[PDB]
A paper describes a structure:
Picobirnaviruses (PBV) are small, non-enveloped dsRNA viruses infecting a wide range of mammalian and avian species. Human PBV (hPBV) has been identified on almost every continent, and has been associated with acute gastroenteritis primarily in children and people that are immunocompromised. It has a bi-segmented genome with the genome segment two (PBV2) encoding the viral RdRP and the genome segment one (PBV1) encoding the CP and a protein of unknown function. The hPBV RdRP possesses a canonical polymerase fold with a 24 amino acids (aa) long C-terminal insertion loop structure that partially occupies the active site of the polymerase. The polymerase domain, which is structurally highly conserved amongst RNA viruses, has a right-hand configuration with three subdomains: the fingers (aa 85–230, 268–324), palm (aa 231–267, 325–414), and thumb (aa 415–470).
The purified hPBV RdRP (534 aa, ~62 kDa with a N-terminal 6xHis tag) exists in solution as a monomer, based on its gel filtration chromatography elution profile. hPBV RdRP was crystallized in the space group of P21 with two molecules in each asymmetric unit. The crystal structure was solved to 2.4 Å resolution by single-wavelength anomalous dispersion (SAD) using Se-Met derivatized crystals. In the final model of the hPBV RdRP, one molecule is comprised of residues 1–494, 500–511, and 518–534, while the other molecule contains residues 1–495 and 520–534. The polypeptide can be divided into three domains based on their function: an N-terminal domain (aa 1–84), a core polymerase domain (aa 85–470), and a C-terminal domain (aa 471–534). The palm subdomain hosts the three key aspartic acid residues, D261, D359, and D360, of the active site. The hPBV RdRP contains three channels leading to the active site of the protein that are believed to allow for dsRNA product export, template entry and NTP uptake. The hPBV RdRP possesses a highly flexible, 24-aa insertion loop structure (aa 495–518) formed by an internal sequence from the C-terminal domain. This loop structure, which is associated with higher than average temperature factor values, extends from the C-terminal domain towards the catalytic site. In this model, the 3’-end of the template collides with the hPBV insertion loop structure, suggesting that the insertion loop in its current position would sterically prevent the template from binding to the active site of the RdRP as expected in the assembly of a productive initiation complex (right). Therefore, the hPBV insertion loop structure must undergo a significant conformational change in order for RNA binding and replication to take place.
Numbering used by the authors: 1 to 494, 500 to 511, 518 to 534
The structure:
């Protein structure tokens, strides 16, 4: 745990007033519930109770959509309540304790079937440090050692080299050696209506130099898979929709579709899972630098130290460091092996229109059952809870959207985001934006980007009308000139970038959003 000052200064550039104040907020927590001005003067309860009166009209035509809405309404509530560090210690422990559950290795044929999906593909080369830096988000925090904006410390960071030496992460940055540690970050996820129901997500904020080295492989990997369409959720929700359609149209007429969920996937992504990820990357990669990368950069996300408080560092191997540049790449490649393994364990072939993304999957194969899947997956040390699994021949959920074989828009089984979930996010934010300092245009833009998720909901027009009420300036209709200049307003403002890399949140194309078109047509 606690290190003397002369140790701490090898991890972080000292003095660091901003890092001191960051950890002070980590210790004390953040207890206030942040409510938006959406339906100001009505409670969260009445907002949902009123929308529900309209919503129930879908229950006769689409009862399982009503069940999906009713399940997500139970989660509506605050997302801004950050517990004090002393109440999150067990959340940290789970990263280190969950990786030693009983676990057996993956089947060879499953690993080969996964590698077959990219048979003809141009092998990946590492992207240079310089080009990798240019592409990445550079306004976000550099982590250890500077805890600054990335753009300000590029030249103190590259050229860099990072590797594990035992339990230490050694980092050489433009000639100087530092010791690397992830900084304990936080995200809130709604999990009920009380302040104490906020889910306390553990975010590992990686050293800039580690993220650069990681992304030298993961940026080319994401790019290649996007163009090949291998992981639809890295492309778009419409690409997800098209593969959901293919899945429903090619499954056995009497087969179920199984929707799997992992409890604490990152924490259980143990060494057995890691070596499958390393093997698959090695098949995608080519050249000597890649061999070097696979031995020295790849392991860091599963073993980097954690700075969880100003004087305090935890060491040891652990599960997926939630927040790594390859957070979703490693897990999605291995989750795909799990899907193949389940069909192969039962003497059949995975329906290739099955999908997965980090801890979320939907699959089918001849004769599939949920119980076979759960057994096949969880023998690898992976935790699953049944009442979060879902099984049906006609519908499924994936990436918090409902899909039905018969619910088609222009031929496609489009995904229906929950109006209840969207209402919770319209009323409740994770951060405070003082009205006096950020203004109504930004709040309105946050609203539009939430509502846009329900663009395929059968009650989307009634839902938009409901949301127009509840906004004083009516989602932009009441702001002079705003809708006519929506592209430009949207650029002053500045989830898919998330699904591809980091896993924290769980561009003038805004003019093509359904919700914008729908508002303009209401003038």
């Amino acid at each position: 745990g606690q290190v003397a000052p002369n140790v701490w200064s090898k991890y972080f550039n000292i003095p660091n007033p901003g890092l001191r104040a960051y950890f002070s907020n980590v210790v004390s927590g953040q207890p206030e519930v942040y409510r938006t001005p959406f339906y100001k003067g009505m409670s969260l309860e009445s907002i949902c109770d009123e929308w529900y009166k309209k919503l129930v009209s879908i229950d006769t035509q689409w009862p399982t959509l009503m069940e999906f809405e009713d399940d997500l309404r139970k989660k509506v509530g605050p997302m801004s309540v950050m517990l004090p560090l002393k109440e999150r210690m067990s959340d940290i422990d789970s990263y280190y304790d969950s990786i030693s559950k009983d676990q057996v290795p993956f089947d060879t044929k499953a690993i080969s079937a996964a590698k077959s999906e990219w048979k003809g593909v141009s092998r990946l080369r590492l992207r240079s440090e310089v080009n990798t830096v240019a592409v990445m988000k550079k306004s976000t925090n550099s982590g250890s050692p500077y805890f600054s904006k990335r753009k300000a410390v590029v030249s103190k960071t590259i050229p860099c080299d990072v590797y594990m030496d035992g339990r230490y992460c050694v980092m050489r940055q433009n000639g100087r050696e530092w010791s690397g540690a992830a900084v304990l970050g936080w995200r809130g996820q709604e999990g009920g209506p009380k302040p104490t129901d906020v889910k306390q997500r553990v975010v590992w904020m990686f050293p800039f130099a580690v993220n650069i080295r990681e992304l030298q492989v993961y940026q080319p990997l994401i790019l290649t898979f996007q163009r090949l369409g291998l992981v639809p959720a890295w492309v778009s929700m419409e690409a997800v929709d098209r593969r959901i359609t293919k899945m429903f149209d090619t499954k056995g007429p009497r087969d179920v579709v199984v929707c799997t969920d992992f409890s604490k996937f990152d924490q259980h992504f143990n060494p057995t899972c890691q070596s499958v990820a390393k093997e698959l990357l090695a098949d995608l990669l080519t050249g000597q630098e890649a061999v070097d990368w696979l031995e020295r950069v790849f392991p860091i996300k599963y073993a980097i130290p954690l700075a969880y408080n100003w004087g305090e560092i935890r060491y040891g191997i652990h599960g997926m460091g939630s927040g790594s540049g390859g957070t979703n790449a490693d897990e999605t490649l291995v989750h795909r092996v799990l899907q193949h393994e389940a069909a192969i364990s039962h003497h059949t072939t995975l329906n290739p229109n099955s999908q997965c993304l980090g801890d979320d999957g939907v699959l089918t194969y001849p004769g599939i059952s949920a119980e076979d899947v759960m057994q096949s997956y969880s023998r690898h040390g992976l935790d699953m809870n049944l009442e979060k699994q879902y099984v049906s021949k006609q519908d499924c959920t994936y990436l918090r959207r409902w899909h039905h074989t018969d619910y088609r828009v222009d031929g496609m089984c489009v995904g229906v985001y929950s109006t209840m979930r969207a209402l919770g996010r319209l009323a409740m934010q994770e951060r405070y934006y003082d009205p006096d300092v950020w203004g109504e245009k930004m709040v309105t833009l946050r609203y539009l980007s939430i509502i846009e998720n329900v663009k395929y909901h059968p009650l989307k027009e009634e839902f938009l009308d409901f949301c127009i009420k509840g906004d004083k300036t009516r989602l932009g209709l009441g702001i002079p000139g705003f809708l006519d200049n929506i592209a430009g307003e949207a650029q002053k403002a500045i989830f898919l970038g998330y699904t591809k890399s980091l896993q924290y949140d769980g561009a003038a194309g805004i003019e093509n959003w359904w919700v914008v078109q729908a508002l303009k047509s209401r003038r």
